Amino acid sequence: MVLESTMVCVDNSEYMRNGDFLPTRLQAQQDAVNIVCHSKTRSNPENNVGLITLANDCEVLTTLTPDTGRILSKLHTVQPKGKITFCTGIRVAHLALKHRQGKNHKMRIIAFVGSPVEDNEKDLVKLAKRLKKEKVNVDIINFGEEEVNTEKLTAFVNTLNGKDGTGSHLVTVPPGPSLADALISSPILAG
Amino acid sequence: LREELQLLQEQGSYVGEVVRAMDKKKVLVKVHPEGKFVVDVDKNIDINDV
Amino acid sequence: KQYEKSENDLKALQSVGQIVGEVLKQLTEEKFIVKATNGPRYVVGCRRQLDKSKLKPGTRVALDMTTLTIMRYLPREVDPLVYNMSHEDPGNVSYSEIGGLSEQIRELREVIELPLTNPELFQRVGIIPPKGCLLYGPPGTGKTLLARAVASQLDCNFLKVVSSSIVDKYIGESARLIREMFNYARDHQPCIIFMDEIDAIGGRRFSEGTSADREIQRTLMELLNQMDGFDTLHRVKMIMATNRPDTLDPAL
Amino acid sequence: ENSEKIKVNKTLPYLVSNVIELLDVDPNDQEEDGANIDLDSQRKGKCAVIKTSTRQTYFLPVIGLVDAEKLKP
Amino acid sequence: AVQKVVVHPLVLLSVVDHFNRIGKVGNQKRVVGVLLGSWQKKVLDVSNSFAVPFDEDDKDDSVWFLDHDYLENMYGMFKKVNARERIVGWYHTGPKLHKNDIAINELMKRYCPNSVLVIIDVKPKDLGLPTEAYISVEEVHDDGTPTSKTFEHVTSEIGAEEAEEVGVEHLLRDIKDTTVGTLSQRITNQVHGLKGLNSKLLDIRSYLEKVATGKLPINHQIIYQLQDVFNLLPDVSLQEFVKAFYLKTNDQMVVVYLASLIRSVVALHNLINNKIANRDAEKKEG
Amino acid sequence: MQIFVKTLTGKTITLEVEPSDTIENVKAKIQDKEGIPPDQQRLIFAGKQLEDGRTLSDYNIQRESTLHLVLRLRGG
Amino acid sequence: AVDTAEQVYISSLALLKMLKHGRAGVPMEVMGLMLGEFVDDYTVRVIDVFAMPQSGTGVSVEAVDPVFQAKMLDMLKQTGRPEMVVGWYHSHPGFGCWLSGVDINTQQSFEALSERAVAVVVDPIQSVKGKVVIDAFRLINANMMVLGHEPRQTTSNLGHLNKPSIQALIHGLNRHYYSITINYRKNELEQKMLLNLHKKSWMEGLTLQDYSEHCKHNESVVKEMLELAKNYNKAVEEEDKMTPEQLAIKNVGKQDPKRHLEEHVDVLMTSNIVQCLAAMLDTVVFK
Amino acid sequence: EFLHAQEEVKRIQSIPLVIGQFLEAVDQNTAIVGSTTGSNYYVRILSTIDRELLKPNASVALHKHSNALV
Ligand SMILES: Nc1ncnc2c1ncn2[C@@H]1O[C@H](COP(=O)(O)OP(=O)(O)O)[C@@H](O)[C@H]1O
Ligand SMILES: [Zn+2]
């Protein structure tokens, strides 16, 4: 019923091409998209969903829309091939959600990272205080391998919601091959 | 030229032929297709000019 | 169901008829000179998307009543006296019913039936086929009967004229039928013309008699023009029938 | 209410005329909206041309309160 | 190839309103919209335009936005109201084109196979002809570029239509103009001509002073393609060209000498015709 | 229940109706507040044309939903 | 609550959207909405104009589905800004630019919803390349037919821009409505570029046309100019003493001395001067 | 302004035009035409028309209501 604009950041880099989740990570992250779009539909039809990737190009396959059947058409032949790119992936979700049609919706970004990022801690803390200046809450869901026992991620989330924040969370990966419903057992409501 | 646009939004004039005049400042004119009309003369013209 | 008929009539009421006229020439891309059929001439325009190449000097269009602009190009008129003699004959048993003149039955076949069904043999010798024929004889020998069996084959492309209802009370208007006839015979390509009893319209000549005779002779000379004239004919066959051939014009 | 409205606009005084011939126009290829008129090409049925008693020919695409089958030229 | 485009004057004004919509930010916000035209011929037509949301940063010019969903629906409306019209390309308002401006073309070549841009200028500080258009090809070079991809100059002009000449030239009455004046436009045309000559030379020496000394890439672009410009430079006053000005200008002097010889006699008719009418209306009045 | 009738003139009209009411009764209430006859009235709910023969429960129109009011536009 | 001397501001984009939709749908009335803002209680300002899909007859025109309407205004809000409908427009092709009996029927529909809803009349047929016949009207009640309708505190909407035309007061003025004045507001940015769109590059300013045809054109024009001088000797010498209004009635016909003689000299002048003078600069400037 | 004045006269054509034929001319800027409506009139002419085009009994255009040479 609450007013937001779901911005999901999918992963079609090469490190999703393995089987540390049970069929393949692609169906694992697709079923995560399956449950969040039904979550945002049964919450409020006024809410709306747009997607972005973190590949060589950050591609807007669907601009922000309340219908989810278009998103489910895009998830097929997603081609998990490319390099993870991070510092512009938030930036292309940053300036996207200032062109919304309902300004009462909260700018919320979810992100699916299943690849090791080569980010600097200086580049993210510039992005983190940039998000302080516009009041954007981002909840990152971790997949697979990354900087394991996440460093520069908990540091990024805390330096996003510092000084009486805690509206942004960091759900790390459950390091176990299982169905995606067990991944979202705690994030079924929030982080 | 500026005045001219109203003056040509103004009705035209018929042309007919005088057969012969009669008394009391009237003539007898078939116009082109139609019958003959007993009409009035102007104040600038004369009977003797007809 | 009865309400559906009423709603069609609600739609039917606000239709406004359109002026019928003919295009004289094209002035510019959007200026056109047309003429109403009852009289005067106008300067008009099309809408946007009328395919203005098809507007030619001589074509016919429909005009708006108030704006007085071109709505649609249309095909050619018919002057429904022609419709009263085109789709009007009822059928007949063929020429097996007639008998006793099988030479003339064969003789008519080469001038009508063969050169349109088989035009190749005439090109091979290299001679244009003949145009028209003449039937004559005593009454009741079957001159009209023979034309019925020929007409019973086509039943769509046969024009019959009594050659006595052509006359009128006006001065023109009898030629105007004949121009419309051959032009209708121009449009459909394999046409047959049949005029029984020419002797009303035929005649020979008078040495400056009644002005009523001059109306007949001017009507007669439109045939003498439009059989030979300037415009030649193609696939237009003319069957002619009479009782006395002596009273006819030698130019015919 | 409709048969009342039919009675009003179908009066008694009429102009008589002649049915010259009958036609049937087809639609066209392109009809852009904004300038869309139903009179142009939205009807593909029958149609007729009429000369009045005042020596004036008219074109009407909508026939009226008769049947096109019963009409002959 | 397309080899020119034809731009109606309804656009060049339906761009500037959209620059006037978001123009309250003042500093910099580039307008990008969608161009509509006719799949006409080798020569091509431009009729209509509409806008699309777009923003982009100052550093890292790779973060930019074209709402595809807005582009599908609003063009679906214009396809609905107008079946004659379909897409031909796009435009942006930037005075000089930016580095970002090639990936925008690489997006929407999936809409029209030859998607063409048009650069306009809301502020032509140049008093010459604005609103020039480009098209992208591949010109793979001796250097070993995998794809040398840069836009090509295409000539352009302002179109005309019978209804829009009514509405435009009605609005020209807010200023005075001499279109009817013969040879008053002409003397300005060589003034507007040679001003264009001086403007292109002050620009080219600014490029040439930088690449001479200190800083610029000295590359095998213009520096010898501009050497060919010096190669033409006709040697005007030499042996036989003198016999081109003294055999042909004096031809055109005689025609002017003829035209003066009648114009003086024509004005002399108006003397006697006035001097007869002057004193003979006087001598009968008195 | 209350609803909202949003015009194209940026104007919001509130109406107290019932979920079982017909659309022509709602159009009568608009005439009660404006004097616009219901033939000159068009009602759009979420991009859908509304018909007078149905009810608000037929289109799942509930309390405090947003309608769109477009007027008849014929000249001539 | 009272009227004033009202004033209809425009946008320059609007009038071109007015006539082009009107000219392309010429033989019937074509319809559209009008989109602007109510800046005060005194003046009104339109900035945008768009049409809708329609369906017409020869005598009437109707709109179609209103699902186009709200979805059009929705996508104009998110690109640019939100705005306000102020009225509407249609055409009267070749007519006397006057509100018809159906045109007035859609106005109690519109004046009841918003107060100062403006009806606007355009005609792309009586408009020539010089000037446009634009028109806008404002409905008045019949219940206040005796009482005054405007307070008339100035002269600006009384005797200016015309007295009302005889073919428009025959239906309207000042019965059932009142007219309203229209001017043209101009932003500086479009004003500067509306000025300069008929000029070219320096290529056009530095051409030398071609000397073969230029001498051929001079060979052409002088040749009949000899023949104009042949006729000029006869008529000027002739001068029958005829009280020259009778000279001025026997000259309509084929008669033309003194008129082509001024004309061809002007053509031979401006061609030869520019052809010389542009050839002068191409030697002084170049090398 | 005189060349702006010539152009603003030209709304008078606008093409619902009817066609007559020129017959004669009385004096300066007033003439006689024979219409194709059967009758015969006494009309006024525009100062724009070049007077070299007259007397073949030329085909001319006329106004509908006011019936002048246009
Ligand atoms: N050869 C024939 N065989 C059979 N019946 C004939 C023949 N000739 C004439 N008839 C009869 O004559 C009638 C038609 O005569 P018609 O063709 O009018 O003669 P004409 O044309 O010379 O006046 C037919 O009803 C038919 O019964
Ligand atoms: Zn009207």
TrEMBL record, chain C:
Sequence positions that bind ATP 5: G99, G140, G142, K143, T144, N243
Residues binding ADP 3, per UniProt: G140, G142, K143, T144, L145
Record: residues binding ATP 1: G99, G140, K143, T144, L145, N243
Alphabetized UniProt keyword annotations: Acetylation, ATP-binding, Coiled coil, Cytoplasm, Metal-binding, Nucleotide-binding, Nucleus, Proteasome
Binding-site list for ADP 2: G99, G140, T141, G142, K143, T144, L145
Entry GO MF terms: ATP binding; ATP hydrolysis activity
AAA+ ATPase domain segment(s): 129-252
Residue numbers binding Mg(2+) 1: T144
GO cellular component, one term: proteasome complex
Chain sites annotated for binding ATP 3: G99, G140, T141, G142, K143, T144, L145, N243
Keyword Cytoplasm (UniProt): yes
Protein name: 26S proteasome regulatory subunit 10B
Binding site for Mg(2+) 2: T144, D196, E197
Binding site for ATP 7: T141, G142, K143, T144
The UniProt record lists the keyword Mitochondrion: no
Positions annotated to bind ATP 6: G140, T141, G142, K143, T144
Binding residues annotated for ATP 2, in chain numbering: G99, G140, T141, G142, K143, T144, L145, N243
Annotated residues for binding of Mg(2+) 3: T144, E197
